[PDB]
Amino acid sequence: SLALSLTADQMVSALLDAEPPILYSEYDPTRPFSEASMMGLLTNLADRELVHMINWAKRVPGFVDLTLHDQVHLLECAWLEILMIGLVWRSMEHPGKLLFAPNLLLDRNQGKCVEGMVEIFDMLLATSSRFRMMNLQGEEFVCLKSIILLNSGVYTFKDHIHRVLDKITDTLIHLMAKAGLTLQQQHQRLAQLLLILSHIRHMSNKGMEHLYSMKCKNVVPLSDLLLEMLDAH
């Protein structure tokens, strides 16, 4: 397709240009919040971010080349992993907190306010810390996000997806060489980035369990799309 013939720098330009925006919350410090309504803010935000994500996916090199059924499957598998890596990315420069929105910053001692989820909070903080530790770059971040999109649901179905993934590895390496890393530093950093996806996968699986719990209690508002995304798991 057109994806396979892109150069590294074109790949990076493509992905950067498709970046969704950071949205605002309807959070109001004047208003009291229960753990329920505090969670409603987050699920409401996730639902709006999802609409943007679906249209960002369309612009990831190689994605539109897939059948509709396969696009659906890939997004259903990866949606929470993608929301989560984005949140961790946004939170990088705010040690000890999660920037859900520019007007909604929560430290982990506010994450206890909801039961069973302070541990999810901790794992996200641990991940944002790791990004900071490594000084993750915007160009590496967009590569990583597209990897999750194509990779997460790939072994629950195709050679095409793997060729595109190889292109993204090439792009990652190019970015690291051009930053002046030795070959040894490049493979090490490559491995460091890719090992993050294992942690992001864990958090998503654990968040999905809390999502299902939340729905069963029918306390927090979940939107029809979120309900269907959850159901796909």
Partner: peptide, 9 residues
């Protein structure tokens, strides 16, 4: 489903 329609829209 909703995702199906969002994707092909």
């Amino acid at each position: 489903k909703i995702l199906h329609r969002l994707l092909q829209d």
